[PDB]
Amino acid sequence: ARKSTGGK
Amino acid sequence: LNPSARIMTFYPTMEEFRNFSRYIAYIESQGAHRAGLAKVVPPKEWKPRASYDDIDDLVIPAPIQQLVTGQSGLFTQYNIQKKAMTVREFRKIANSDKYCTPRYSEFEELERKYWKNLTFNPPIYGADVNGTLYEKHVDEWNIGRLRTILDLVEKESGITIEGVNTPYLYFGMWKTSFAWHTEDMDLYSINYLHFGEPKSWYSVPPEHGKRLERLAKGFFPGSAQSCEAFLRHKMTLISPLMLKKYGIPFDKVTQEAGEFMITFPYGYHAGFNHGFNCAESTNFATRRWIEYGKQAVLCSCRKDMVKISMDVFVRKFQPERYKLWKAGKDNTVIDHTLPTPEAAEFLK
Ligand SMILES: O=C(O)CNC(=O)C(=O)O
Ligand code: NI
Ligand SMILES: [Zn+2]
């Protein structure tokens, strides 16, 4: 897992 | 102690600045955490990097085009990965006539332009880049090595979680956005604006976070039925006029180049970049976070979302409650007004 700024 | 739960700004001396965790305990002793967000302006003499002239060859591996759909203060952001580009290539696009910051006088004017235009001319955000622009010798507030209890994750287990216990860079342009969210595992975050145009933030006090979630669930009922924690998808944008209209308390603040923002456990925040800029960010913890970690409502519906094992923290810092917690009987209720235990020093 990693931090993510956002999805779609 | 900050009964208004307003965003506080701090100007430490270099002496105060030096011990990071200690200064976080201090700002909490002043009630800063009640706002969900705080600003720290470091001492003038402090600089994390002598110059940013050498970074044009730095690669942004997965820049995202930000397509926004919606109306009437309620939006969904779709983040579409584009091809790798360099910082040179990114800045060229950011400052071009097509994507550059519009002309404006008062900040309220730029803010209205953001909320009017956010679904047009989708920008590119150079987000989530693994790295640090800090020089190796900088020991104060180094986002690469803050030395908080969050280090127990890697120390004890070997687990690195990129952006969470390692640093991320963010290259912004006009109208690039971050959706309403709290941090992974309801951790704290730290954000340093290395250079460029401002970043503007909105925040809801942790004591009203549940109220924001209730409101969001009503506004996006489909999303809520498929995932409890759908705000963790970081796709939901809600204007301050909508918050005001439904009685959600919130505050706003603009971060300039050279300033730090701190976000606090379960503090919902959102914002946008004013123009071409560069921020560095990571997560961190204090002892107060552990209860938040224990009770964080996580996204189930996506693969390999961030989940941190709380076991090591409860054993070390809450040994009296470990058996109870492991038996699923730990009914601790979080009081969002209380500062972290380490603030005792400043309250005595
Ligand atoms: O800078 C951004 O795009 C968003 N940052 C954050 O949400 C943070 O630092 O907690
Ligand atoms: Ni955040
Ligand atoms: Zn989900």
Account of the protein in words:
It is classed as oxidoreductase. Keywords: SGC, oxidoreductase. The complex is a heterodimer of chains A (8) and B (348). Chain A contains no helices and no strands. Chain A has 8 residues and is largely without helices or strands. The N and C termini of chain A lie far apart (17 Å). Chain B is an alpha+beta fold and 348 residues long. In chain B, 25% of the residues lie in helices and 24% in strands. Chain B has helices at 14-17, 20-29, 87-95, 107-117, 151-157, 209-219, 221-226, 240-245, 289-295, 311-317, 322-326, 344-347; strands spanning 8-10, 37-40, 59-60, 64-71, 74-81, 85-86, 124-130, 168-172, 177-181, 188-196, 199-204, 236-238, 251-255, 260-263, 268-273, 277-284. In chain B, a hairpin with a 2-residue loop joins strand 4 (64-71) and strand 5. At the A-B interface, loops of A face strand 5 and strand 7 of B.
For CATH, the homologous superfamily of chain B is named as: Cupin
Alpha-beta content class of chain B: alpha+beta
Q: Between the first and last Cα atoms of chain A, what is the distance in angstroms?
A: 17 Å
* Rg for CA atoms of chain A: 6 Å
Family (chain B): Belongs to the JHDM3 histone demethylase family.
Subunit structure (chain B): Interacts with histone deacetylase proteins HDAC1, HDAC2 and HDAC3. Interacts with RB and NCOR1. Interacts with VRK1. Interacts with FBXO22; this interaction promotes KDM4A ubiquitination. (Microbial infection) Interacts with HTLV-1 Tax protein.
Binding site for 2-oxoglutarate (chain B): 125, 191, 199, 234
Binding site for Fe cation (chain B): 181, 183, 269
